[PDB]
Amino acid sequence: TSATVIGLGPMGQAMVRVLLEHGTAVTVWNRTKSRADDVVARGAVLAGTPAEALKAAGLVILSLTDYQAMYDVLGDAGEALAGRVVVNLSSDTPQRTREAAAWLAKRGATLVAGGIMVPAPLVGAEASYVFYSGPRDVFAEHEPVLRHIGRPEYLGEDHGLAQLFYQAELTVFLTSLSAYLQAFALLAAEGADPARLVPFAREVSGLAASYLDETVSQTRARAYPGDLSTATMAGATAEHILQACRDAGVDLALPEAVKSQYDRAIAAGHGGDNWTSLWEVVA
Amino acid sequence: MTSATVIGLGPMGQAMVRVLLEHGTAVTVWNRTKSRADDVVARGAVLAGTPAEALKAAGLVILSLTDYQAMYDVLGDAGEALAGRVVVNLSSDTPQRTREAAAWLAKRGATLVAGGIMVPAPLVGAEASYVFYSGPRDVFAEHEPVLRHIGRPEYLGEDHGLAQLFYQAELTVFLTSLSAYLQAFALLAAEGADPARLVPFAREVSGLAASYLDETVSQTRARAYPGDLSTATMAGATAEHILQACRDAGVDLALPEAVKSQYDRAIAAGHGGDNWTSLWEVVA
Ligand SMILES: NC(=O)c1ccc[n+]([C@@H]2O[C@H](COP(=O)([O-])OP(=O)(O)OC[C@H]3O[C@@H](n4cnc5c(N)ncnc54)[C@H](OP(=O)(O)O)[C@@H]3O)[C@@H](O)[C@H]2O)c1
Ligand SMILES: NC(=O)c1ccc[n+]([C@@H]2O[C@H](COP(=O)([O-])OP(=O)(O)OC[C@H]3O[C@@H](n4cnc5c(N)ncnc54)[C@H](OP(=O)(O)O)[C@@H]3O)[C@@H](O)[C@H]2O)c1
Ligand SMILES: CC(C)(C)C1=NCCc2c1[nH]c1ccccc21
Ligand SMILES: CC(C)(C)C1=NCCc2c1[nH]c1ccccc21
Secondary structure (H helix, E strand, O other), rough: OOOEEEEHHHHHHHHHHHHOOOOOOEEOOOOOOHHHHHHHOOOOEEEOOHHHHHOOOOOEEEOOHHHHHHHHHHOOOOHHHHOEEEEOOOOOOHHHHHHHHHHHOOOOOOOEEEOOOOOOOOOOOOOOOEEEEEOOOHHHHHHHHHHOHHHHHHOOOOOOOHHHHHHHHHHHHHHHHHHHHHHHHHHHOOOHHHHHHHHHHHHHHHHHHOOHHHHHHHHHOOOOOOOOOOOOHHHHHHHHHHHHHHHOOOOOOOHHHHHHHHHHHHHHHOOOOOOHHHHHHHH | EEEEEOOOOHHHHHHHHHHHHHHHOOEEEEEEOOOHHHHHOHHHHOOOOHHHHHHHOEEEEEEEEHHHHHHHHHHHHOOOOOOOOOOEEEOOOOOHHHHHHHHHHOOOOOOEEEEEEOOOOOOOOOOOOEEEEEOHHHHHHHHHHHHOOOOOEEEEEEEOOOHHHHHHHHHHHHHHHHHHHHHHHHHHHHOOOOOOOHHHHHHHHHHHHHOOOHHHHHHHHHHHOOOOOOOOOHHHHHHHHHHHHHHHHHOOOHHHHHHHHHHHHHHHHHHHHHHHHHHHHHHH
């Protein structure tokens, strides 16, 4: 089989190296042509233009920073797009993903939206999985090649779905990473060693994740029993974190935001309810 | 035969009282809301009439209150009932206010050991339970054989602020992770998808985040942020996609805006090509 990969960031390069090793014939284009040097040594073919890349295969995988990069790179391709399957594995909003399907469908191209849920060194590892959404039959046709990148997770016909799941996962992932930096900054600022927090940070992350079922259960019921923990109690800590960050001279954005959820839930009369009562503020 | 007081009968105070009783400690309690002692008294706790009495019932006084102000509201009228006591305060507050509370207790001849219990009420006394402690090493060592029943004691050092500092850093991780779960669930629900469907994927990605802890420590200690695997520009684009997706679906923007603003500021300070860890330069 032949595949085209447009975008040779670490994710693009990992996908090329995987599809090559599984004996696919891979055509690449990149904005920065030099970054193709590695995958070309491994027998990827370098296209001169995006439109050239599109002509080299019926399966076109984009790994770009956002969906605007797709418009920037393919806006000029005209009839090179007709009959192509565009598998867009780029971050963007659900609404821009849905717009992109219409856009591509006017130029006679099919969108399959995806999101790869592992970093580049795990692409095509056992851990690797990818959300997909858009037309099932079209996806099914290329699933056999795409699967080398990771366990497909087909979500449905709405192109926005894979993107919604990706953005929901990355809210968890990026916000957690920011919370690690926040926790480390608070220690470092008070002269303690962030290294000493690590084992306890793992513990508390594992603990946080053990609340997922109760969060889903209570929020879908809009029922927030406060017997084990009140928004008043949790909100007090949110203020203690903010004040400790003010005292230590570290950034306030993240703890301000968390405190704001508790303050609005308390002002709204959920002081005696579970922390899940913040759903009444966030949702 | 050992003796202990617990002041504060929220879920954690009660949890701690049942654990101590079940380990054969004599437990005297006081709560602002005397009714909440019903179950622990039925388990052999003694309900003191006043805070002053409860202090005199043991030399080991455990506080489980919402903040350290609650300790002032309750121990203000104590005076010399406080003389010679070990106050193990297991309440959330700032490091600064913990250090202040030590000085304040020492004027009334009482010793502070600050602690932070790192598990919820149901896991108090369970294998997973652990408690940060900081304060005088010899005083703490004296009451540790009773305290360790509540969970594995982690003694951090002499500075009373230390346990409060590690507690606040842990709850930064914990409370922000919970808000992030709400944020993710809100986004699915607003677009008519079922949050229940994200749960196993949300669990997996929390695991993935935690596997970055060592590289985060390494890169921020060095202030060295190689972007070969992930740039702040790429992670920042997604931070903006989250805020834009939430804006589109009518979900609260506060938490995604906080995260997106770290990326904006790191990129504007010239770290666009660096690792996400370069946000250290804006956060620290
Ligand atoms: N890194 C990860 O761990 C990871 C994991 C899962 C998903 N993702 C997602 O996968 C996608 C790719 O990420 P990545 O980290 O591999 O790389 P990235 O740093 O997002 O770069 C991806 C590619 O996009 C190109 N690009 C960006 N804007 C462009 C534009 N306006 N016109 C033309 N080309 C443009 C870059 O070109 P240049 O090469 O010329 O700079 C690069 O080839 C992103 O949507 C990201 O959210 C990343
Ligand atoms: N829930 C958890 O999972 C958990 C886990 C670890 C640590 N913690 C921390 O442990 C402490 C106890 O939390 P919790 O969830 O068990 O309960 P909580 O809802 O904070 O209440 C604890 C106690 O504080 C009392 N209180 C609050 N303000 C007071 C005041 N001004 N004067 C007198 N009493 C006052 C309450 O009295 P009334 O009963 O009269 O209202 C109650 O006995 C907090 O610092 C919390 O951050 C909680
Ligand atoms: C969650 C994961 C691994 C799929 C991922 N997607 C792109 C955002 C991102 C990811 N891994 C990262 C690691 C650092 C910064 C952003 C990262
Ligand atoms: C992290 C843990 C379990 C020790 C904890 N400390 C007090 C804040 C708090 C805790 N667990 C909670 C669960 C819900 C709301 C607040 C919570």
